[PDB]
Each structure stands twice: as C-alpha cells, then as structure tokens.
Amino acid sequence: GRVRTKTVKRASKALIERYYPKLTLDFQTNKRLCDEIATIQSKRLRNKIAGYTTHLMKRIQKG
Amino acid sequence: SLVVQEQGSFQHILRLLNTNVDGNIKIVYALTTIKGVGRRYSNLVCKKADVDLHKRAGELTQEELERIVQIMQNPTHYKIPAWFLNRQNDITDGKDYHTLANNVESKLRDDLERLKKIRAHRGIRHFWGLRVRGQHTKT
Amino acid sequence: KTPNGEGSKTWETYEMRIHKRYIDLEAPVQIVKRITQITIEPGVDVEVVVASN
Amino acid sequence: FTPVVLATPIPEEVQQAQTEIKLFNKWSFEEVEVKDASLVDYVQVRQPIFVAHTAGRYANKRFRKAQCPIIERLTNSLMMNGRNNGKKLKAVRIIKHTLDIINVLTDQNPIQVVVDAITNTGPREDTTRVGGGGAARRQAVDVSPLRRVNQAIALLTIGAREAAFRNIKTIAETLAEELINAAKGSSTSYAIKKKDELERVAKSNR
Amino acid sequence: ALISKKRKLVADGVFYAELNEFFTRELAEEGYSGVEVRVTPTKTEVIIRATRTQDV
Amino acid sequence: PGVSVRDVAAQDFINAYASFLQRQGKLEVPGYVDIVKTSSGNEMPPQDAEGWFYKRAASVARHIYMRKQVGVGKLNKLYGGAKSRGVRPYKHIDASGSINRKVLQALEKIGIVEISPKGGRRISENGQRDLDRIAAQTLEEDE
Amino acid sequence: AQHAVILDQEKYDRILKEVPTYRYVSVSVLVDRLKIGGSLARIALRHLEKEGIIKPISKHSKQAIYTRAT
Amino acid sequence: TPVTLAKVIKVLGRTGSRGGVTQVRVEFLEDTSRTIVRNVKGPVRENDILVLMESEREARRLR
Amino acid sequence: AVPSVQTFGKKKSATAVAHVKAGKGLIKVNGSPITLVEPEILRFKVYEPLLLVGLDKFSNIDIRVRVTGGGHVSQVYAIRQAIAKGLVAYHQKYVDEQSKNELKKAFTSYDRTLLIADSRRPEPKKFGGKGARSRFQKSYR
Amino acid sequence: IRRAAYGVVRYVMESGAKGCEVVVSGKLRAARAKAMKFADGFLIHSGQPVNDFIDT
RNA sequence: CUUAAUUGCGAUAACGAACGAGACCUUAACCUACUAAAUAGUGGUGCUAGCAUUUGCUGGUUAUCCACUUCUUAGAGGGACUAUCGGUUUCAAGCCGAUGGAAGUUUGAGGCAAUAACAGGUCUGUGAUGCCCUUAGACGUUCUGGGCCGCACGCGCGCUACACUGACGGAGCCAGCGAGUCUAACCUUGGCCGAGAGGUCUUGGUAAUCUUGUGAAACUCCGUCGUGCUGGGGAUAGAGCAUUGUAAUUAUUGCUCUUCAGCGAGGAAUUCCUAGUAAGCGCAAGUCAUCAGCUUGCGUUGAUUACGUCCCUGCCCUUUGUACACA
RNA sequence: AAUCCUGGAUGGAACGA
C-alpha cells in the first residue's frame, strides 16, 4: 500500500506554509528545490516529500 | 538397414550351460539371462567372437554358439584382461577363474561356510541372516 | 544463531567486505621513498613493489 | 518473394516463408479462426507468432494469461508431472509433431482443429459446494470462459498423458487423436467424457 | 610472511579482539574504553583510550 | 568463398570425419578397445563398437580446432557425465583418461594435432587443412 | 514379450501390400496393428522411404512421421 | 441442443463458502432488456459472455 | 574509419555483444553463421529480428555476435536482443531517426523482450527450504 | 542497585546523551530472577541508526 | 473511511510526546553520461595458420604496438515520486485502468526490529557462574581396546525409483555463488603409465591475473531398445585393484566383474507453494586426513492455478456474557 | 421533450482433565 506517512505530510505542509511563492507544479523542480532548501537525509524522502508537495499544490490550484 | 527374409529354422529356447536362454531377443541380454554373465561380459564375449550383435538369438548357428561358450568358460585364452573376471585371485589356487554356472551359488555357499569354519564375523552374520556389509540394522 | 540446538533452525550470514585497489607509478626513487613515507592511514594495508617486468 | 542472397548464405527456400507472411513455417494464423462465440476474447490469435516458446510474463496480473497464445498454453500444460518440469523444449517439439499429425490425418489447419477441440471440451456448467454450516449440498453454477479453456487444456493434456503412459503410443500421437476426437464430438476422449460427466452432474444438482 | 589478504585481515581482526579482551581483564580499574591499532612502516602503534592516564 | 569447421553443423561434420578416418584406416585403434566403458560413471560400453574411436577422434579434432589448447583432463571433464550412484544422488564424474590420452597420441601420430606451448595439445596446420577440406566435402554433400 | 519379433516369411508381403493404404504411418501404428515390433518398425520404415513408397515429413528420432506417396 | 449466451453487465460480489463463486448480472443478446442474476465459478471481467444451459433461473446469495 | 557500432543483449546471465559495421551482408555469431545456432527450434527465434523488418536491411552491414554466460535459451534471447539493438543503433547513428522509429515500432509491437531486457531476476534462497519460497516439510508429531 | 543504575543514568544524561538504558538481570533480593530496567529520555531499537549512534 | 501497518484522512476531554511500524542499511535489477583499468575486455595494426583467393572468412600471437571503454569491475552520482492522463471517493486520505518507463504488489528479497512474558532450551560453547558432590585403587588428566552404527518392532526429515515427453551409447558445452600452500606443504594445469580408481616428472597461483572460458548436470543431434519386472529400479551379497590415515577388521571411501530383491504411482491421513516463484538439474562452501543421500548459498530449464474467502486451523480490533484468574 | 415504482430467511455431530 502506498499511503504517505506523517513525516512526509508534515514536511510538505510546512514547505507549502513558508515557500508557496516558489514550488512549481513539477516534481522535478520541486525535488531540486527540496534539495536546495531542506536538510533531508535521504533521496527517497526528498522525492516523497516533493511528490506530496506537488499533490498539495495541484489541489490548491483547483481550490 | 534392409529387411531380410529369415527362415523357420529359428529356434527360440536354445539353451547353454543349464539355462533356458530365451530367443526372439538380442543375444547379449539373452546371455545375461544366464548366471555369472551380465551385459558387459556378454557384449565382450560376443565381440571377441565375430558375431552380428544386431541379430536375434534364434539365429546364431550352433558352431557360433559353442564358440561363444568356449570363450565364456575359457576366457583368458582369448585375451580377456583378467580384471574383468569375478572370482579373481581365487583363494583356493591363486588364479583367475570366472564362475559362470550354478557353480556361482555353490562357491558363494562355500565361501560362506569357510567363513563360518574360521568363525569370521562376516560368516556369523551370514549365519544369523543379518546385514553384513556394515549397515545400520535399525531398518 | 543459537549456541545450543533447540529452536526453529535459524541461520545468520555475517560478511566482511574487502576492497582492493592498485596503482602503477613511473617514479624516481627519492620520490618513491617520499611517497611510501607519505599517506599512512589506519585500517588500510599498503604494499609496494618495483620493477614489474 | 524474389530472394535476397547474402554473404552468409541464408536458406532461400525458407527465406521465402520467413520474410513472407508470418507463421510456424507451415500453418497460418490467417483463415484459421475460432468457430464459437463466447471465447472470442481468450484466444490470442492475431497476434501471430513463429514458435511457441515465448518467454513472457503472463501469470502476473490477472488475464495476460488470456492474452497468451493457446499453443504456449498447451506446451505449458504438457510440461508437468515431476519428471517433465521444465522440458519446454520437449513440449514444443511434441506440439510440432502433434500438429504435423493433425495435418496428415484430416488435411486442415491443426490450429483450427485445436481451437475446435478446446471450445468443444470447455464445460459450460459445474458444481460448487455451498457452505450451509456442515451439511450443505452441491449447487450447479455457470462457468467462466477462462475456466472453460483452462479445464479444456488440462483435460486434453491429462488424457493424452494417461494414454501414452505405459503404452507404445507416443504422447504426440495420444494428444493428436484426443484433439481430433474432441474437435469432433466423438465421445471417445477423456476430455469430452469428463465434460459430459460434469454437465450431467450439474443437471442432477439443479 | 607471504599470506593472503583475506587471512591477513581476519588475523588483524582477531588481534584486535584478543587485545580488547586482554585490556578488558587487566585495565578494569583504570576505565578502559577501547583500543586502536595503526600499522605503519618501521613501527606499529597501539592507542589505548581509557579514562585516567595515571595508572596505565 | 571459403569454409571452416565453424561453418558446418557439428553432428554432420563429426559423422563425416569419423567415416573418413575409418575409411583411411590409419589412425590407430589401441587394442583394449571394445573392452572399455569410456567413463567410470557409465554402465555399458559404446553401442557402435566397431567404431566409436574414430567418432571420439573426430570429436576431439573438432574440439581442438575450436579451442586453443586442450589437455587430457579437459577432455575427461568434457566427456564425463552424471554417474547414477545407485540409490544416492547423481554426480558429475570425469571420463576415462586413457581413452582420451591415446586418442590424442594417435592424432599426433597421424599428424592432425601437435603438442603445444603453454601445455596441452594444439591443432596443426596440416590438421587444420585436413579439417577444412573435410568440412568442404561435408557441405559439398548437400548438392 | 508378446508378439512380432521377425516376420520370417509373410509380413513382408503384408507390409508391402497394406502400408500404402494408411494416412499416417509410424512405429506405434505398425505396432498397434500388432505387426512388426518397434525395432523392425524402424527398419521397415527406413526400407520404405528408401524405396520411395512412403512420403516422409520427419526430422529426428523418437517420433517418425510418414504418409502415403503419389 | 438449446443454449443461451449472456453478456455480463455488472459483477456484483463474491459469494460462497470459500469465496470461489461470483454473483453476476447478465443481459443476453437474443431478447435483451431481460436481465438475470447468476452465479459463476471462475474469473470474470464485465463485458464477458457466458453460456447458460438454462435461463429460467435466478440465484440467491449463497451462504 | 569504417562506420560501426556495438551493442548488447541480456537474459539472466548471458551478455551477448554485437558489433555492427558496414559490410556486405555477413551475419555471424560466436564465430559462425546464424543459420546453425541451436537447438533447431529457436533458430526462428533468432531469425525473428531479421524478418519483421525485411531482410533487405542487412545487405549493407556485417553483424558479428559473441556470447558468454547463461544457458542455451538465455543465449538465444540475448543474441536476438543484441541483433535488434545493434540494428536500431546503426539506424540511429548512420541512418535517419525516421527509419529508426519504424524498426523500433515493429520490434516493439512484437516485444517478446526484443529491445527491452527482461527485468526478472532470481529471488535468493532462504533458510528453511530447498528454495526461496518453498519450506521444508514439518511434522507436528 | 537502584542507586547505582540511576547514578549512571544521571551522569550520562548530564554528559549530554539523548538517552540511556540500564538493565540489571539476575537475583535481586530473592532467588527467582527479575530484570530491573532503568531509563531516561529517548531510545531506539531498529535500523542502521542503532549501529551508528547507540553504544551498547 | 483508508492502509501491509494505532498507516493516514479526520472526529474528538483531551493536549502535545516517545517506542515500535515506516524511515534506515545491504543486495538484485537501468545508465552507449563522469573517473579510470595488460590482474577484465574490444578495435585496429604488425607477425602467422587454414580455406578461398576479388576484396573476404575463421583462428593463433607477448613484452607487436596505438586507440577506446559498449560488454566486465568498481567509486562518486543520477533515476521512481505510484510521474502523466482518465475514472472513483465526503470528493479527503486513498483505490482502479491505461500510457511512457529499466523498474509502477511499501519495485523484488532480506537485515535491524517494541512493551510484557515462558518457571521454553542451554550449567555438554565459555577460565560465564552460586549451591551440592567428587578431589589422588579421583566421575581430574592421559594410554590401550571396544561402544555411541548394536535389532522382533513403531515414528519423523529425506535419497533413488516404479519407465518410451523414457532409458542407454555416441555427438550434448552454456553457468554462477566460492575456496585455496610459511616456515608450509593447499587448489592443482600440462606430459607419461594404467580399462578404471588412481600413480609419477615438472609448472602456475598466497590469487579479478593459476586451478578455472570451474568447457556442471538436466538439456539438444543421431542411433540401439520396444513394452516384457525388460536392457531402465539397483537393494543385497562374492571376489579383486587403489587411495586417505599410526590403525579401516562390525565392510572409511573410490573403481571393475558378477548376484539383480522390493517397487507397477501408494489407502486412512498430511506438508510446501502464486513468480523468474513451485518443481526438475547440478555446482561451490560448511564440517573434513578420508567419507554426504545433510545443511548453507549459487546459478541452469521453467508450468498449471487464484488475484479471492473466513468454511477448517489460527491472528488483530471493538461490543457483549462469564460462577474462569497456575486464566 | 418522453418517462408509473420497488429489496429479502433459517441449515446436523463436538465428552473429559
């Protein structure tokens, strides 16, 4: 099962809370930005966080 | 290869050395029907004799059969290498005889009874009817 | 895993890694003894040979 | 059709068929077609193939099995009973000889003969034990097309196996006569006998 | 001399372990934490990390 | 266009070259032939038996033409198989070394195979020419 | 150990008369007619393809496949 | 040899003791607009076609 | 110098390297012709890359293949993969990407692991069994 | 035993650990064994962070 | 409601925390982009062999070079995050399908793995150990020799098998995980002798370089059998030849010939298993002077059948009843 | 612009410490 965990969701929520005038809807540049911006200790977490931020950005743009 | 038209002189019980050797099969295994000889020995014998091994046993006229039997009972006289034999070195006389008869059973029994005479462990186990080649007798 | 025999027959593979490198250097001998007295480090074994022909 | 000779000499005689329309060097997956509706989804024909080895991943999701070629499924069903696990090559050769024989007898597409055998051996009704709570009865239920074709293949291969077992007749010969006597409703084959048994048992239990 | 690298490194490990047990049994009073070995040319040094450097 | 032993199927080439060696009648046959099993893990002698030495000779001639250097132990590995060890599981067992050794010696005698540097036996240029001409005749058969 | 090791006069005639009438001929068929055993079935099939009576479409051992000729 | 085909339109739910039987809503091409509920043994996709030996039936949920 | 490429095909162990240079038709394997490979069945499996394109697309080149590792079937699949990949590599580097797309479309409409390698690999063995998922037979008394 | 273990825990968490744990197993105040278990702060049991951080 | 998951959405007399799970680590799969590499390969050029000769084809070659790194090794990195699209869901967490992709069941397999307990196993692993016993015709230590293998029987793992998708005899040749000699005698190539096992003269390797392209088997090409307890099952048992070891006798093993048993698919009962898995097939290591039918791993060939249910055996949560609490 | 509608069950044996 592919349910995201609270570390991922909370980090994404924070990144949206304080870096919304950045963070395009694209996973790739969101990922590179996560690298630029957060001391994440693993590529896998970085990519999961980027994916969830992208998901939240999408369902922000549509409401 | 091609199909022959063999004729009804074919005999299909023709016997050698006190055993009803079957016919209508191949001669090597027909001979393995005999005691004391097996597939390897029979093939060697029928090779040393100039014989068509792709031919059944009810063929093989009697001079051929007796040449075969002579090779069997006196093998070393036809350059059979003497490691091929069964009762090699033969503690009665110290020569290499091939036991191909009911002599196989008689000599089996004689070996057992001389072991019993000298009171060998192998002979005592043979007496009681147990296993003797060094096996677990739990099963 | 167990000292004794009782239990589910559980196994354990321990493993050691051994990494190995080699370099070839066309050197004069003063630099050779300089570079053998340089670069000493724990946990690493160094071998040197000359005239590989 | 005009040959293309080449430094490495290809056999032109079969280069013809090679670079022509596609088939197992003999038999087309053109005019051959499944006689029956209801099971025109579970016979792969179109796509075609060359030979029935096809090291593919079909038993993965749910129905790529159904998209697999029936000939591969026959080889796969022949490859069983312990001493024949693996030996997909033996199975492919057996199928080669079997289709050769089904062409020799009954000049026809043996692919079509096999398909008719399958669709005529597929049992269209089967029994299941309902629960109840300790004393329940068999209930007649319908049978899906996929289970129809699977049980068909199983029955054919098992009949051929139990025939050829301890008999001079070769497994290819047994499979051939069984597929023939199943393409026709001969009622001499293990497959159709079992089909009739199951169907009338269901009729009894309804 | 002239020993394979596998057995060489296994021997290094067993040497470390034997030294560890030895200094554990001896330098108990002295707060023995651990050891380190550093092999060099001309010399091989053995560092002993312990609490107090008065008794050792 | 030119031909080699790599251009001909192995079974047909070995049959042709074994028949050629049998018709030429000049390799050797040792004398303890038709009195051996060819492997300790076998259970019967060969069934050809007015032969099988030209077959083994043709096979190792093609094998040496393929490789660089083979020795006797390599051929014992190559011609050995699974020994049925009665009621215990099977095992790979190398073939009879005396057969392969005497085949290699007879092929040195007829001049197909030469001794090699870096050990083992090598194909000779005479044997290379003979094998190529036999392969030419082999695929010449099908016209 | 049942039947038909060697023909010895007449199954030559029976073979040469009857086998061009079949649709499919192989060892198992010649035997399930309880004619010739398997060894002679192989031999006879080689003989008949030699003479050109039967049309062969086999390629290897352990399964022979012959039909009529025309 | 009267036999009736039937196209599946709604796979309903799995049914039976061990869960090896599936309830299916079927609509058959000759005289469509006459839907039935039946039970089936094997795998089913919807838009699949059945072969009913009898159509004068209607299954209940097996227990 | 002469135009050439080199590609590879894989199936579980068997890397089959394929050099493809400009030539005059010649196709060959471990040092022979593709008419003779093995085991008389899967010769059509190795021919498959040659026919779906149409044999005219080889007269101007020289394929040479070499294999190691695996078994007979694995090596067959490796060499057909290698032939296809070498062909499309040649048609990329020296012929137009349009014809490349055509060849790739054919080989991938077929796609029994012809360009893309089979991702399957052996699950390891684990204690308690002769194999990975299989377990020994327990008794209960 | 309580004084000893809690003194260790105090000294460690003063030294600046994220956490400690002291298990004392055996015969305490009786014959039948009992494992006392003392702790403070934080602790992990799983993963590579065990091999990295905790010292046992 | 959802998830493999007290995993989340969220609801809310609870708030904010910790452990576990997950994260993490290792391995397997992708990279014609980086760093390179006679201890891995390739190409070409010399020299050389055979066939063709008209260019060509298949080979060999250490001090012939020169160039390169696709294949092989690694080190640093990248890559997948269920991406995109469409459905479904209060429209949230999520789920389903297709597309592309090396890879779309937490990508696969594992490691680490909570609280509380069992009066589980183990004093025969420990110079880990309390108490008790024994402590110099000593259950201390050591030497000789036997036994741990002993048989009317019952049980549990397993190995061969009961045959023509099969045996045999020739022609089968394609693997991967490994290990290996110092004050030594290990892995052994090549040549020679011998039917065989194996013996002898040299050589290489302290190892990506030598054993070893571990040219393993199953498997494919040709034939011989031919349905018969048969030639395939290969137990017993006789005789002989070697090897290991001080010593092989109740046979250590290996080889040769002979003897050629039961077993024709196993009631009642019952195990394991859903994909490169089951099964078949062998190989290395472990123990080891020698001896595998064992185990641990490796690869080779590679199916059928579900993609569910709680009916049997059990597990988690909630509610409920209890005269139970070593439950 | 046509247009009549449906929710629903049971199912044997199982002693002891």
Side-chain angles (χ1 to χ4, degrees), chain G:
Chain G
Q2 300 291 114
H3 58 74
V5 183
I6 189 163
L7 58 97
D8 198 358
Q9 189 58 77
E10 291 148 339
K11 308 180 104 168
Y12 188 80
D13 306 308
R14 192 188 260 206
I15 289 156
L16 274 79
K17 282 174 70 58
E18 299 181 359
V19 305
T21 69
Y22 294 138
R23 295 286 297 287
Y24 156 67
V25 175
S26 68
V27 175
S28 308
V29 172
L30 305 177
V31 172
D32 72 12
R33 296 284 185 287
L34 74 156
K35 314 170 178 282
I36 43 167
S39 314
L40 285 196
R42 294 188 266 106
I43 293 154
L45 288 164
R46 290 199 192 88
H47 169 217
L48 295 155
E49 68 180 3
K50 273 197 293 182
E51 289 190 289
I53 291 153
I54 49 172
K55 193 184 278 171
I57 52 181
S58 157
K59 57 95 168 184
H60 80 105
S61 64
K62 300 187 287 297
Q63 184 68 19
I65 175 62
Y66 303 109
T67 189
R68 62 176 73 269
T70 57

Side-chain angles (χ1 to χ4, degrees), chain D residues 75-95:
Chain D
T75 59
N76 282 342
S77 169
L78 279 158
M79 161 164 58
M80 69 162 54
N81 285 101
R83 70 189 324 159
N84 309 121
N85 288 131
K87 272 77 79 174
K88 175 95 141 169
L89 301 182
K90 309 285 180 205
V92 170
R93 211 162 279 163
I94 289 152
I95 285 281

Side-chain angles (χ1 to χ4, degrees), chain A residues 1-5 44 48:
Chain A
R2 203 75 72 96
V3 167
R4 276 83 63 184
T5 180
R44 189 172 156 81
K48 289 180 183 292

Side-chain angles (χ1 to χ4, degrees), chain D residues 53-55 57 59-62 65 72-73 76-80 82-91 93-94 146-147 150 161 164-172:
Chain D
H53 194 260
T54 307
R57 300 180 261 186
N60 202 353
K61 203 194 283 185
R62 211 172 159 199
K65 191 198 273 197
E72 188 181 357
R73 292 176 55 61
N76 282 342
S77 169
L78 279 158
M79 161 164 58
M80 69 162 54
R83 70 189 324 159
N84 309 121
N85 288 131
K87 272 77 79 174
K88 175 95 141 169
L89 301 182
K90 309 285 180 205
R93 211 162 279 163
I94 289 152
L146 190 60
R147 198 185 170 74
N150 299 345
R161 191 170 298 126
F165 184 64
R166 216 180 283 149
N167 183 19
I168 295 90
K169 290 175 66 53
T170 60
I171 187 157

Side-chain angles (χ1 to χ4, degrees), chain D residues 1-128 130-206:
Chain D
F1 57 84
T2 71
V4 174
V5 78
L6 191 145
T8 298
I10 293 95
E12 285 78 4
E13 282 92 329
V14 194
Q15 187 175 340
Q16 187 267 340
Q18 283 158 34
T19 190
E20 273 178 338
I21 298 96
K22 187 153 150 282
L23 46 91
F24 175 59
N25 208 21
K26 271 82 74 176
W27 301 298
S28 297
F29 303 127
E30 297 289 351
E31 76 305 343
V32 170
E33 66 94 35
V34 61
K35 184 66 67 62
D36 186 16
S38 85
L39 289 155
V40 195
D41 269 348
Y42 305 87
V43 168
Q44 171 266 352
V45 172
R46 313 180 177 71
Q47 264 269 352
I49 58 173
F50 273 110
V51 313
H53 194 260
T54 307
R57 300 180 261 186
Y58 303 106
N60 202 353
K61 203 194 283 185
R62 211 172 159 199
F63 289 111
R64 202 136 65 259
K65 191 198 273 197
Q67 293 192 320
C68 186
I70 48 162
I71 309 301
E72 188 181 357
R73 292 176 55 61
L74 269 156
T75 59
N76 282 342
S77 169
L78 279 158
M79 161 164 58
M80 69 162 54
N81 285 101
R83 70 189 324 159
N84 309 121
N85 288 131
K87 272 77 79 174
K88 175 95 141 169
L89 301 182
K90 309 285 180 205
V92 170
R93 211 162 279 163
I94 289 152
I95 285 281
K96 192 174 183 296
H97 296 330
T98 316
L99 302 171
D100 263 355
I101 293 154
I102 295 158
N103 190 21
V104 160
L105 296 78
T106 307
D107 288 324
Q108 210 168 6
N109 301 123
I111 307 301
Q112 189 71 65
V113 172
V114 165
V115 166
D116 293 331
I118 294 281
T119 197
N120 293 346
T121 43
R124 53 194 85 81
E125 191 72 26
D126 201 354
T127 49
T128 193
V130 68
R137 62 176 191 87
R138 291 189 188 148
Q139 302 253 358
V141 288
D142 315 320
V143 181
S144 167
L146 190 60
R147 198 185 170 74
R148 279 182 72 200
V149 53
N150 299 345
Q151 267 186 356
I153 292 162
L155 288 166
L156 298 156
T157 53
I158 291 158
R161 191 170 298 126
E162 285 194 11
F165 184 64
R166 216 180 283 149
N167 183 19
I168 295 90
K169 290 175 66 53
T170 60
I171 187 157
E173 290 165 354
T174 64
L175 188 64
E177 67 185 2
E178 285 210 343
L179 296 157
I180 289 154
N181 292 329
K184 62 169 76 70
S186 163
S187 310
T188 58
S189 63
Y190 184 96
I192 281 177
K193 286 163 75 69
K194 292 290 197 81
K195 182 183 82 75
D196 282 1
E197 190 192 298
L198 297 176
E199 285 189 13
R200 68 194 281 282
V201 168
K203 191 175 262 181
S204 174
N205 302 127
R206 77 173 168 256

Side-chain angles (χ1 to χ4, degrees), chain A residues 9 11 14 29 33 39 41 43 45-47 56-57 61-62:
Chain A
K9 294 173 185 252
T29 188
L33 198 144
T39 305
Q41 295 283 309
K43 188 190 299 229
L45 266 289
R46 179 243 287 165
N47 288 330
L56 294 183
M57 278 271 175
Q61 291 288 103
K62 67 101 163 177

Side-chain angles (χ1 to χ4, degrees), chain I residues 1-23 25-31 33-86:
Chain I
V2 66
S4 55
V5 310
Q6 42 189 330
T7 66
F8 64 103
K10 283 195 201 283
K11 171 79 181 191
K12 310 194 212 179
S13 291
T15 183
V17 191
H19 305 78
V20 176
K21 65 190 200 75
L26 194 81
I27 299 162
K28 293 194 109 71
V29 214
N30 223 319
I34 199 158
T35 78
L36 273 165
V37 186
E38 208 169 3
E40 181 270 328
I41 304 280
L42 321 179
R43 292 182 194 176
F44 273 100
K45 295 286 273 181
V46 297
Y47 294 148
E48 271 166 353
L50 309 175
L51 321 182
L52 308 169
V53 297
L55 199 136
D56 57 354
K57 309 219 179 214
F58 300 127
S59 301
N60 306 315
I61 66 190
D62 172 21
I63 310 188
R64 293 182 183 174
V65 174
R66 173 145 203 198
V67 302
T68 46
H72 305 117
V73 192
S74 303
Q75 279 172 208
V76 164
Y77 275 100
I79 59 177
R80 67 198 284 267
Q81 203 184 309
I83 285 154
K85 285 172 72 179

